[PDB]
Design a protein around this ligand. Sequence first.
Ligand SMILES: COC(=O)N[C@]1(C(N)=O)O[C@H](CO)[C@@H](O)[C@H](O)[C@H]1O
Ligand SMILES: COC(=O)N[C@]1(C(N)=O)O[C@H](CO)[C@@H](O)[C@H](O)[C@H]1O
Ligand SMILES: *Cc1c(COP(=O)(O)O)cnc(C)c1O
Ligand SMILES: *Cc1c(COP(=O)(O)O)cnc(C)c1O
Lengths: 830, 830
Amino acid sequence: ISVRGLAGVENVTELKKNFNRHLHFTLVKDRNVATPRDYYFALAHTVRDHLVGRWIRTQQHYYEKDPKRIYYLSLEFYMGRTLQNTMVNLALENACDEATYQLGLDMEELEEIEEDAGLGNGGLGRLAACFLDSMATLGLAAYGYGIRYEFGIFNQKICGGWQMEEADDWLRYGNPWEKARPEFTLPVHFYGRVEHTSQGAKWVDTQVVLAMPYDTPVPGYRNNVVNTMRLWSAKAPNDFNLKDFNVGGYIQAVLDRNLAENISRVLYPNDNFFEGKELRLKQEYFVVAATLQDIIRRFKSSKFGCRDPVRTNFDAFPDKVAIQLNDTHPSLAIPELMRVLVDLERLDWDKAWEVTVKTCAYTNHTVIPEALERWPVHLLETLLPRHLQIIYEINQRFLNRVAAAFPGDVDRLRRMSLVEEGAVKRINMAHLCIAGSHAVNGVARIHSEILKKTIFKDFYELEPHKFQNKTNGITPRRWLVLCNPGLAEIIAERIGEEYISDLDQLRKLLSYVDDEAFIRDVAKVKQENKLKFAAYLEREYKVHINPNSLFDVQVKRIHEYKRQLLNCLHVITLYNRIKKEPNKFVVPRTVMIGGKAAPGYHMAKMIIKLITAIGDVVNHDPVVGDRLRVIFLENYRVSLAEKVIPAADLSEQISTAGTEASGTGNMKFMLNGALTIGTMDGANVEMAEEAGEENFFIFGMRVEDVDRLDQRGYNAQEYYDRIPELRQIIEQLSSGFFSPKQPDLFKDIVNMLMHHDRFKVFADYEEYVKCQERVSALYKNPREWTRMVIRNIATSGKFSSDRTIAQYAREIWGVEPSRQRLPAPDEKIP
Amino acid sequence: ISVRGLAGVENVTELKKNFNRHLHFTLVKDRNVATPRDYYFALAHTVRDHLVGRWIRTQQHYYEKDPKRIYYLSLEFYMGRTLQNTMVNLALENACDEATYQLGLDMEELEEIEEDAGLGNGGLGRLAACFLDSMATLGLAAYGYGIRYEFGIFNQKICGGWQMEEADDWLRYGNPWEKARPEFTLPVHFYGRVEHTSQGAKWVDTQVVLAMPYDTPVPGYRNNVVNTMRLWSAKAPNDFNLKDFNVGGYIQAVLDRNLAENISRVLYPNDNFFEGKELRLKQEYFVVAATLQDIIRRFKSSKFGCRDPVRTNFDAFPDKVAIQLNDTHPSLAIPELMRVLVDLERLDWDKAWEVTVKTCAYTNHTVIPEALERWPVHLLETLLPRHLQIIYEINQRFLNRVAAAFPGDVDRLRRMSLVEEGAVKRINMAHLCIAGSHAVNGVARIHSEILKKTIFKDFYELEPHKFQNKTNGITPRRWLVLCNPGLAEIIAERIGEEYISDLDQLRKLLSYVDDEAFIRDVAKVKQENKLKFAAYLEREYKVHINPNSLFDVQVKRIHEYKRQLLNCLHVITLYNRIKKEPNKFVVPRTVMIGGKAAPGYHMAKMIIKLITAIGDVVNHDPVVGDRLRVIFLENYRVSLAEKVIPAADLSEQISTAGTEASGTGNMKFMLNGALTIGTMDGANVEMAEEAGEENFFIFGMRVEDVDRLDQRGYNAQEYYDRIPELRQIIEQLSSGFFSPKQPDLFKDIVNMLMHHDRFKVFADYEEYVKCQERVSALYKNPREWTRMVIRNIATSGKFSSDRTIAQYAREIWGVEPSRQRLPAPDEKIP
Ligand SMILES: COC(=O)N[C@]1(C(N)=O)O[C@H](CO)[C@@H](O)[C@H](O)[C@H]1O
Ligand SMILES: COC(=O)N[C@]1(C(N)=O)O[C@H](CO)[C@@H](O)[C@H](O)[C@H]1O
Ligand SMILES: *Cc1c(COP(=O)(O)O)cnc(C)c1O
Ligand SMILES: *Cc1c(COP(=O)(O)O)cnc(C)c1O
């Protein structure tokens, strides 16, 4: 059937009876009233049963051996569905497929019922998910720590061409994967004041919110390692949240509990944008405060909570603990670790600081200013008074270091301060992270260089040793074996299965680049993939596409820097050329644009309306026929990505040079047989460098050109004046060609494009459509297109998250990865 | 060990492996980190497994055979713990006791970990729970329908002698008994307006709240019948509760969902008191609206949703459906049933009314005015506009009936109206229920007569056939076999086990009233019970009592009509007499008073403070010694009742004649070997009548005397003037003898007692202490005390809820009870 494992005789039988056990005893249903949803849960529970045994021994193991622990703090974990992934990592896929088949059910139909764990916005959240999978696969004693939002990223609905947001009640029917652990609930404090008494400061008169943990298993790839993702939930104490007496109402007091519990109710839907709301700051301290207590508790036991030197010496803390900050969201971990060590454990400042810096590491994910976290001091002042005092003290000592290093450099001092003066004083969280971490890294080579040359230049000059790079990656399990079994099979037919946990081995595919059968096969799976997606489209969304055309897709969050608008200009151009010479042949294309717009991002929502507007015109023009279709992919999410990427021919990664830190969708497309048209931005550079620029469609300004233009001054009118095709499009938008009933509908877009385009869309227009012509040319030659595809796939190995994690492990965490199978799952009951 | 069933070889082994399965697979723990709480859950899950099989076949059965269905609508279901009860009804107790013993655990210790399902206030809620158990035991196709509050009755804490309320987070660790059924979620409407168009009215522009059901199994006693208790939970729709667009905030919109979901957040803690809050009214319509849809859906399928006459003829609705209204809380079921039949199904008014009256029955539980539900019209007008119109129309037609029956009786018309004029117009829910039901019943013989003679006199004259009586009862399973296995065993040793489901058989115990061994045994279990309670006291609450003294207990909600104050006067009297003649012998007593005070009931909270105040003095007087102890039983609830009642010697049921509708605690004490001192009120009359007044300690005014006094006019000064002992107590309270630091602390109590005692405490004082002297006399003669006890126990049979339910069944529902074992639980998987 494929190498989804063995469909053993004893195990298919075993699976079937357990499926029935759960349907009866767990779901309390009988075959006569069971629905596909019930069948999905019975299966989910049956599958979950197989990893609890391994989950328990893995955790017990780490307790016995006591290795260094890695704590990945992130406010986002974009997990997606987990049924299939679990089957794949446990080699259960074929057996489950067989068993359910014998039970008369279609596993694929049941898999579609599982709700996505959308506790993420985009790249940053999904990176965290891929990392978890890789850390498990590499045998690291790692823990994912976050917030259990009851409402993840909103579900997007298109109404009249506009985006409509609606609550993502992903827990509505329950989550069979998580395990509530109310017995490990911890208290978290807010507000209050600071008392300075005799021997130390005291955080007093605080409001208490409880943090209840929920553990979700994270299985490594076929190695019997099952790590843990711990998500905190906010709960109100039953005392003060009722007991602070003297009139108000008993009923009201109980109803008001949903004020402390609002902390974990919803994820902020912002991608690369900072919103300084109090609720957000609360979420940030909540995950940090709860997590740290858990970390220290584990440390106090270790082998120190037995003997060792005997005296809670936190000197070995950094040797046993490593906490990675996914961006600045969990940045409060630094002053919080200090607070606990100094205020509670009573360590001297300097010893505490040494420990803190040695256990913390910070990862930066963007350079755009509006995404940078700068919290107003009056907010920190009210909500976390002691942390503000600690931050000021950290700032004081850090600046003294600078002054001593750069005597008399008074501007450098203000530039480097953690405190920003002006309208309102703010705290620069990024500056805090650099000061309190022993390592700072970018997510792509160019992005990392930009940090050193630009944004964090002064910090780099001060401590050059802190700055590193760790190019992002993706997990070959979910992003290849899971979503594209067809491609994984044919690769396996030639080079084996060892590449799934050793993606570099894909290079061996280079020697089949002239293999006639392989070329035919690679081309076949892609055709099968396109057919299945074209079908899904009519199934779930309804209104035909042509599977023979070039599948041109751009899927990612809607942003001005991502330039979906530039994609728009090209689409309209294609349209206008066809209308000019109708009876001239052109390579057919289905251009699919999908992504979510943050609810408050007006421009982004205007772009979504533009895309649908273009489709309204283009898709109903008889002269165009089936040569050009414009489709907006609704509710783009992980589960939808697993469907479109394997069916894509052309991947669009056209952000303005220097704005996309890395990107990961680009890597997803490369490993799945799509060719990339893009700019020398983020990881695109390393991808082209790995496949060879001849096998990539690069165009546009490089970073240098962008800066040259800025020195000069960007004037969009120039481009409008010298390019008639561009001029024609702008006047079409301006006159209502794409919006008849509301002719001025797109005035904001035009206005922006002509007067305040921060991402110089026009500057890359000419080189973009010219480059697009080159891909159309190559698509006309199936054999050569496929051979170039093979060159990309065979060369994507470097982009696996296993590589990324191995580097973090060795160069930052100080731990050694291991592909050693944990000693079976085998029963056991001590 | 006892007749807690057989500890079979095959089943103890089977139990143990399933206990281990759950501890591993369900709880995801290993013996080395498992806590008593984990052990309790493993067991709970193991036990629950045994009734799912029966649960499924019971429900399937009713679907096949299609008998008349009984729907018990109540806003309260005071369930308590359910582990032991389930073991008892499935004959699993000894086997579980053995198995857990072999696993090295103490079952009793694990049982104490289960949280109480406190979804009730007192009598009314517990009655509903006992009824459910009896309906299951009598094989009735019955369904309990209510609200799943996430916070039940508050947990009471005594601080400085005052009651402190704190949220009852009973779901904190989960509920292994319930089964969420999200797939059966239903919509419920609120607000909106009424449109009158061509062919009918339309309820329009309403706000939608979703009702999600949670099913809990209700097992009959050893007959393999497992009925269902369906509890609704409020959930916000994800559309409008987000989709009603045009600025407000996406985050805020999501946070605001906890506005629609507040409907099922907390139970109103009022016992016999009406609070006209909007939230309450919402709860009342919510349970009614959701339940009715479920009822009609089931009816539409039946055997009509196949064939029958073919034409949704609701003429057979009353032949297939019976809905019992537990008080007026679910009274909206009447106009709601009309709304659906008339507005949606399109039946003519008269045919609809006939159906409604024929399927609905109302049970009244109190005659005190402040407990009567009278909803302001402006509230119904805003929240349920169509229901108000329907009510007015029902009123119009009803009054026309009256006018026609009593021509010219204009005062009768206003008196009987469902609408009450005055300050604000109100709707008398009780009048509504009588008009729309074919049966109205009281809960005790005297209470039922009082309804006919007083409160509902006019209604009785109009339709004498509607009024009946159904004396309350209690379940012998929980209230005897479960809480007092020792007593159940010795009874079983003489007369067998058939009495558990046929309590009348207890009469056979009359022939052992002179049996020397029996008297010794009955006396022994009570001594063992007192010793165990005296121990629990020091274990969980701490500060000694004497097990040889007379256990004088009064446990029920704190109310002015219950007269805990009269009990107080007696206690102080005993104290004063001892202080007067220290070296005179008196029968030692431990008087225990426990109960909860509604948060807004100032007087009730003042009485709790008085009780503790008396104990502060009495319990620390050296001259008193161990002859008199005053203890306030904290957090009185079902699980606590199962502990005190079996250990009680004297039961206090001293409410003012005519105020306690029935009472059920009194029955609990009688069947558990306690003697009753009380007034001729509620069911006390029938109890004394059943045991013989010689075996009861009756005192005080009868109803007639109360009324005589009211004609005359009650003057408490008279009593104060003629009784020096009474005078001495009042002056002690007034001067601060019981409250030194705050001498005027009890001025409200004294003031009330002397000037506004609605329950004439003083009028029954003299006859009360005189009667108390008689019980002390009899306690001095152990042999005769025990023989009188045997006379009560042997004669309590009539007070089993099986008797009560059999009468409801035959005289109101029109169904026949059956003690037929359902065809085993045996596997099966169709
Ligand atoms: C806070 O900045 C970010 O979130 N940055 C992003 C992203 N928005 O997902 O992170 C991911 C993961 O590193 C990068 O691939 C992407 O280029 C970058 O923009
Ligand atoms: C609404 O009135 C009531 O709730 N009445 C009560 C009770 N408060 O529990 O109901 C129970 C059950 O019928 C009666 O035994 C008790 O005397 C009566 O007061
Ligand atoms: C991989 C992924 C992303 C990141 O896309 P980029 O193109 O790097 O912005 C965002 N959303 C989903 C659902 C993803 O799978
Ligand atoms: C039986 C019961 C009641 C009713 O007591 P009465 O004396 O009838 O008021 C109230 N509370 C609990 C916990 C009960 O078990």
